[PDB]
Write an enzyme that holds these catalytic residues in place. Structure first.
Site: not given
Ligand SMILES: NC(=O)c1ccc[n+]([C@@H]2O[C@H](COP(=O)([O-])OP(=O)(O)OC[C@H]3O[C@@H](n4cnc5c(N)ncnc54)[C@H](OP(=O)(O)O)[C@@H]3O)[C@@H](O)[C@H]2O)c1
Length: 180
Positions: A109
């Site tokens: 994301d």
């Molecule tokens: N940071 C905050 O405060 C907060 C709070 C709530 C929500 N959010 C939201 O959470 C999101 C954050 O984005 P991001 O890029 O960090 O995370 P993301 O887009 O939610 O996820 C990243 C990727 O990690 C992969 N993954 C999951 N488990 C795994 C594992 N064991 N090994 C390797 N890969 C793995 C996933 O796909 P696979 O299934 O393909 O592995 C996933 O596409 C955003 O949409 C944001 O707005 C953030």
């Protein structure tokens, strides 16, 4: 070894190792997946091997990477990652263009423009990490599944994008082994 499937390139741990080990500048982009697998220590070890090879390494942290503000920062500190090598989006996003490789581990994301269209999401209207600007973009994740936003990431199809399917910790450990 590496093989093409569908509209994307599926690389191997050795491909990743070969590419980064021979690059001059690599920018690591950690996300949720790195936290799920607690791959930070293996990641820092990889960075160590690279820096030993003379490669320039740095980390790009998106404001909402992971699941809490500052999530990646604490995990990296935990792995004894040098504080000076960690940068926030606003101060490193313009550096991707000068980077040979963007190592995206467990992130999705925060690199996706289509992810900040939802007003109910924490990432709504925020800038995104321009990993495409780098020579090569490596994505470590288990599959082609979406992230929290639940939207497809077209970067998975770009010409300079290689997918490394596997657990973030396992895959990173294999890359480290293939490197030395
Ligand atoms: N940071 C905050 O405060 C907060 C709070 C709530 C929500 N959010 C939201 O959470 C999101 C954050 O984005 P991001 O890029 O960090 O995370 P993301 O887009 O939610 O996820 C990243 C990727 O990690 C992969 N993954 C999951 N488990 C795994 C594992 N064991 N090994 C390797 N890969 C793995 C996933 O796909 P696979 O299934 O393909 O592995 C996933 O596409 C955003 O949409 C944001 O707005 C953030």
């Amino acid at each position: 070894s590496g093989h093409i499937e569908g509209r994307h390139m599926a690389g191997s741990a050795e491909d990743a190792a070969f590419i980064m080990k021979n690059a001059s500048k690599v920018i690591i982009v950690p996300g949720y997946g790195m936290a799920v697998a607690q791959a930070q220590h293996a990641l820092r070890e990889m960075a160590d091997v690279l820096k030993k090879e003379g490669v320039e390494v740095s980390y790009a942290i998106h404001p909402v990477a992971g699941r809490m503000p500052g999530h990646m920062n604490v995990l990296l500190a935990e792995a004894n990652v040098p504080y000076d090598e960690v940068f926030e989006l606003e101060e490193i996003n313009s550096s991707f263009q000068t980077a040979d490789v963007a190592f995206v581990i467990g992130a999705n994301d925060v690199t996706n423009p289509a992810a900040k269209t939802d007003p109910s999401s924490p990432i709504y209207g925020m800038p995104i990490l321009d990993v495409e600007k780098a020579g090569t973009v490596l994505f470590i994740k288990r599959s082609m599944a979406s992230g929290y936003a639940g939207v497809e990431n077209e970067l998975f199809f770009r010409n300079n994008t290689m997918m490394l399917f596997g657990d973030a910790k396992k895959m990173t450990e294999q890359i480290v082994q293939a490197m030395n």
